[PDB]
């Protein structure tokens, strides 16, 4: 009982690793969202061209 591994010694590692993972996922989601938005805009432009014709 002199030492209990139930305390978190490497809290810094947990924190930094979670930060990096969160940044990675945020980047992926930002990219896919921008892609979706641009696709929606191009579809709207397509309907614009159909109506003009």
């Amino acid at each position: 009982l002199k030492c209990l591994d139930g305390e978190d010694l490497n809290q810094g590692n947990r924190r930094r690793l979670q930060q990096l993972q969160q940044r990675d996922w945020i980047e992926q989601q930002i990219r896919e969202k921008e892609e979706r938005k641009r696709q929606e805009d191009e579809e709207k432009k397509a309907f614009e061209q159909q109506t003009l014709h």
């Binding site: 614009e48 061209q49 109506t51 003009l52």
Partner: protein, 420 residues
């Protein structure tokens, strides 16, 4: 956000509006096809930019012209509400007879224009005061919409009659009627007059063949500069209301004067330097403004100056304070620092600095004295009245109208004498 509905009207209104939308299309880089190559324009399919504006006249003439000239494709044909009977230089004809027959559709389209906005700030008008169509229709529209929209402000870029040689002979009647109307339901009667424009074009641009194109372009430049420090980034921003609050100490005292700077010929352009001292020299000279009231024969209740250009700031304020504390006689005393300033960050197309100088002065009392005098001389003989009574109107209004006119100047002169 903070949009603006432009209301044309009358022949002068239509021409000046065509020129104004031309200047705006120039500044915002819009070619006359309608594409780009929200404060004024509305977006439409395919990136098209349709101007948020409405034209009107009891005659389809000037409408046909502006639809035939350049930038005639911009304005949508739903906003060309136009009657075909004509008004004909009779204010009553365009304010009591045909007013009730077209104002319905005009209010319909103006409502469909305002509700289509999100947060409207104010209105802005371009019309004359003598021509029946312009004065009558425009002031009736202003009455209706101001009794409709109470919180937002008005703006009447109104061309008063020239002093010496009129354009119409029954001008003073329509002038006094329109100025008794607009003094009650409008916040800025920014007056413009042609003879001062002629003097400018002969004295500060050397164009010896002054055509209405150039005069309209000049007033267009002034009109654009009025609000430029809003739709652009700014070191110290402004709007249509910061002016309106730094300008009128009392709601009746809301008849301004306008001035634009700098103005140079082609020859002078190479040599004349462009720094804020000479811009100030220009903007504070008598022969440089657009009003038939010598600013050196009155005073300034207040005067604001919208600058444009990436220039210094301390020198602006220093020159303002110098111009004030030097001619403290030519300014009024009981108010401190009667000169307000503002600065944007983008100069117009073709220059690097620009000053729109607007001023709530008390020199225009000469103009209103002249108009009232012409009214007396043409009324005390019942002249030209059998028209303004055959259209459902008794002389009473006129007298009381003129009566109100008197009170107006009766305040101006008064405040030019108080000292404390």
């Amino acid at each position: 956000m903070r949009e603006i509905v432009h209301i044309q009207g009358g022949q002068c209104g239509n021409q000046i509006g065509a020129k104004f939308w031309e200047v705006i299309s120039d500044e915002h880089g819009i070619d006359p096809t309608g594409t780009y190559h929200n404060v004024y324009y509305n977006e439409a399919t395919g990136g098209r930019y349709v101007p948020r504006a409405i034209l009107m006249d009891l005659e389809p003439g000037t409408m046909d012209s502006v639809r035939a000239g350049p930038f005639g494709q911009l304005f949508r044909p739903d906003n060309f509400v136009f009657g075909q009977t004509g008004a004909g230089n009779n204010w009553a004809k365009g304010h009591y007879t045909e007013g009730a027959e077209l104002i319905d559709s005009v209010l319909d389209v103006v409502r469909k224009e305002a509700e289509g906005c999100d947060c409207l700030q104010g209105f802005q008008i371009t019309h004359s005061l003598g021509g029946g169509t312009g004065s009558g229709m425009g002031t009736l529209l202003i009455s209706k919409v101001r009794e409709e929209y109470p919180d937002r402000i008005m703006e009447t870029f109104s061309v008063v009659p020239s002093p010496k040689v009129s354009d119409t002979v029954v001008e003073p009647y329509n002038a006094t009627l329109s100025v008794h109307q607009l003094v009650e339901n409008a916040d800025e009667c920014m007056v413009i007059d042609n003879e001062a424009l002629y003097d400018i074009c002969f004295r500060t641009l050397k164009l010896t063949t002054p055509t209405y194109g150039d005069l309209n372009h000049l007033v267009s430049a002034a009109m654009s500069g009025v609000t430029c420090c809003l739709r652009f980034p700014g070191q110290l921003n402004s709007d249509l209301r910061k002016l309106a609050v730094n300008l009128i100490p009392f709601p009746r005292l809301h008849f301004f004067m306008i001035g634009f700077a700098p103005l140079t010929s082609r020859g002078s352009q190479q040599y004349r330097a462009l720094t804020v001292p000479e811009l100030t020299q220009q903007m504070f000279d008598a022969k440089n403004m657009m009003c038939a009231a010598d600013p050196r024969h009155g005073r300034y209740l207040t005067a604001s100056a919208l600058f444009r250009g990436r220039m210094s700031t301390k020198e602006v304020d220093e020159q303002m304070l110098n111009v004030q504390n030097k001619n403290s006689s030519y300014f009024v005393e009981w108010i401190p620092n009667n000169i307000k300033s503002s600065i944007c960050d983008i100069p117009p197309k073709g220059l690097k600095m620009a000053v729109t100088f607007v001023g709530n002065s008390t020199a225009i009392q000469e103009m209103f004295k002249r108009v009232a005098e012409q009214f007396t001389a043409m009324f005390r003989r019942k002249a030209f009245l059998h028209w303004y009574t055959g259209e459902g109107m008794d002389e009473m209004e006129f007298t009381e109208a003129e009566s109100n006119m008197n009170d107006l100047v009766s305040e101006y002169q008064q405040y030019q004498d108080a000292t404390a």
